[model samples]
Target: WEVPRETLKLVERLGAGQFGEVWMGYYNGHTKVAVKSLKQGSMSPDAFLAEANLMKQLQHQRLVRLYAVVTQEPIYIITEYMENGSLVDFLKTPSGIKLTINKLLDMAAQIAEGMAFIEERNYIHRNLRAANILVSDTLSCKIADFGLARLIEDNEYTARFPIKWTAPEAINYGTFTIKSDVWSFGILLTEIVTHGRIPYPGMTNPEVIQNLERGYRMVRPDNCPEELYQLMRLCWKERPEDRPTFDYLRSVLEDFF
Candidate 1:
């Protein structure tokens, strides 16, 4: 909806969300770009700055590349168009429903690669899930969605929890840190192997918290390696310090593959 006929040629509407709509557009008779157009009144100036600042500072192979940005009228965040969409959507299709061991490790490594870079820079992707992981035609992955992200400066930082994907400690104590992201990545591990099933499906948010308080852990998928499954379970432990760091996850998944 950001593009007028005179400005850019809109070929398709790829996705829509509460904040905005993403459209595939043709520009200058050549390149195809995914344009994320933010809706007016939906975002405060502070929200826009938080998103923009994170996008500007983030640079990693497993993260989506920002091509250009236009800020006149509605904000337009232009990026390379990914054909396969989100991991959640991809897993629903038969072609993407099954994953080889190498494929799973590569996906995990890709996420960890992005996580390592972000954590090194002292930022936190408060929300990490299969829905935020996009696939390309080459089967490579790119992490998306920074609206819930924040920079971690010190011990006093408190972050918002996304509930379902959050680690037990994160759920009890609202703080998004590098370690917290790893915990969510473990949840991502479950979602991927289950081919996009909702985490703790059939449970309400409060139910999930109560279960976490009781030291409950996720059940492993059938095909996941026992070592990998155990690693993810440890990441979801009730203590934030108990979660593995991105460097550890990257190395563990590397060995797992």
Candidate 2:
């Protein structure tokens, strides 16, 4: 049966932005859901539409499902609720999340699996980051936030993204490709191991970009393995072609696991 009015109930605020706010809600006998309230005719509407279409066309265990959308009143979108919130929080914990090398490998492999599916379908998640990735109570990783994502064939896009997580070529050339995502994955890897240390903490986007062009790099945290350092460096290399493909990455990550 389709969602009835009373079947859906707003619970609480999950997050908010200029587009609107996301509320924790419930539907279909109290199953948890994420309700995004958007301003009518907002700029985010198109992006939401794109994400909805992609969700309908693609199926992946590591991607969130778009269950429903209400274009009336609050202009809401309902998605499967992520119980444990973002990977960012797990990393931000001061004491760090208790994870071993094998644990990191498992998570990284899952991430690569997700990335492989996305890239294989010719979609580029331009804003891949810790906050955009969701982890479940089972430690399963599912990527979210397709607002900045775009389809790629053979052209480039000047997507304005956080420079700290972007690869050097992207910061310098305003380009995004599958290779660029690999770079972001490197930063993601660092976040996974460090438990979230805010890459180059205290530096602004511009500062990070300048330093990157000057051969500076976001250091791997103490908990990060030495092999991970090499991986990060290769992904952050100036030439996009120099970076390893997702296939290679997945294979390498399997070894760590």
Candidate 3:
């Protein structure tokens, strides 16, 4: 959808990411929206248009809704405003501590469901992480931040992908696939259970890679259920084919809730 820049009234800066700054804003005169204002020249016209189109085509309850795109100047992608903000930061507060086990499981299942949808479409969310997940005031969880996501065929890989959350094959061969995304999802579960603790706490990128190469996986968080930890380990399996599909993961996670 084409949205006029004049219709958007910026309320406050929410945060910034690789592509641009995100703001909590008002649309027209009353509607709430999150405005993602792209930095000038941050992306080539072709690439920006391509990504914007891809985002516009995606619609799922577990995925943030991209309402419209403003392409005139200082390009903007408007989306649904998530009241609670990023899941990672939210997990650090008292609210996170008060969440019931069912709520946490629901969050996990929602992410897996969204990823399953993306996987079926042959896309890889190369940047999946706790920070990329958002929670609504109603406690509904949705995946956000498509900055590094792409179709598996496009296969863009770089050292910039989060090392701690990345799968071994992705880090070593710069490979990205649905399985690699499943690996990242496993790490995301760790974040949920640990209340946003950094993955591989106290380890540098190089050290984390070294440890992973030697078959070491993250230790289970305190009081984390054995079954859930096993699910994480399955995603981290050395061979991509050994990892479960998002559909399967979602089924398993649903049983927990």
Candidate 4:
């Protein structure tokens, strides 16, 4: 349904930016939703909704579901809300620490399954990192922010690449594909086991690239299962084609469940 701007009861602010604000809101003062409100002079309502329109069509339990949009001024996008926020932060908390290794495998499997769905649709999530994944109260992980990467600042002029999570080919040529996403997932796996530590701990973005060229990778986290480390290595293969498919990963991770 086309959401009327007036029907949205904006509540506490959830997130904001130079161009927009996200709030915990309600539909007609009843249903809870996250409202992303955008102003003009940047991304217009027509353009935002055009992308949101695409998001609304794709629905899966592992992905955030867009509910409706407000086409009026101060463009509004209403979508499913995740109370626990993103996995990047969650992984550092006691809740994440307390989870058994098997559950961690289950978590990765969930995201891999979701990634498989995106791959099947020929959608490349240019950005696939722990931060882009949201955790539910029940601790289920759901992939969020799909093709919406276009809304982010382009790195052509040089300031926005997710260097640590990005693949070498992408950094060298600005190309993105399912292969690059696989590389990112490899980094994400490292983050999961390491309790969300930043990749290449002391290395800056450039240093990471330098070390990557030398064939260096993050050492396995203490207590990380050797098998999982090997899996991450597969994802970080120098040749993207050598990386494991999410379908292959889904099956491999099942045994850990």
Q: Write the per-residue lDDT of candidate 2 for residues 109-159, one digit (tens) a residue.
A: 888888888878887788788777877777788877543555321111111
Can you write out model 1's per-residue Cα lDDT over 1-257, one digit (the tens) per residue? 23343456668877666666778887655878787777778666456545555666786788887766666757777777888877877887887776777787888888888887777777778768887788998888898765354422111111113478876555665656777788889989888877788888899889988888888887888787898899888777667788778888888887774
TM-score, structure 2 vs. true: 0.86
TM-score for every candidate vs. truth? 0.87, 0.86, 0.91, 0.91
- Where model 1 places Cα greater than 4 Å from the true spot, the runs are 1-7, 147-161
* Whole-model lDDT per candidate: 0.74, 0.73, 0.82, 0.80
> Which model scores highest in lDDT?
3
Summing lDDT over every window of 10 consecutive residues in candidate 3, give the lowest-scoring window: 151-160
Please tell me which model should have the higher lDDT, number 2 or number 4.
4
Candidate 3 clashing pairs, residues 3+ apart or interchain: none
Q: In candidate 4, which residue pairs get closer than 3 Å at backbone N, Cα or C atoms, i.e. clash?
A: none
Model 4 agreement with the true structure over 103-156: per-residue lDDT tens digits: 888889999988888888888888789888888888889887676556253222
Q: Model 4: what TM-score?
A: 0.91
lDDT of 1: 0.74
- Count residue pairs with overlapping backbones in model 3: 0
How badly does each model clash, as a count of residue pairs? 0, 2, 0, 0
Query: For candidate 3, lDDT tens digit of each residue in 1-257?
Result: 89778899999987765566778999887889988777777676556666567677677889888888888777888888988888988888899878877789889999999999999877778878888888999878888755344422111211113678888888888888889889999999999998888899999989998898899988889979999999999998999999999999999999984
- lDDT value, candidate 2, whole model: 0.73
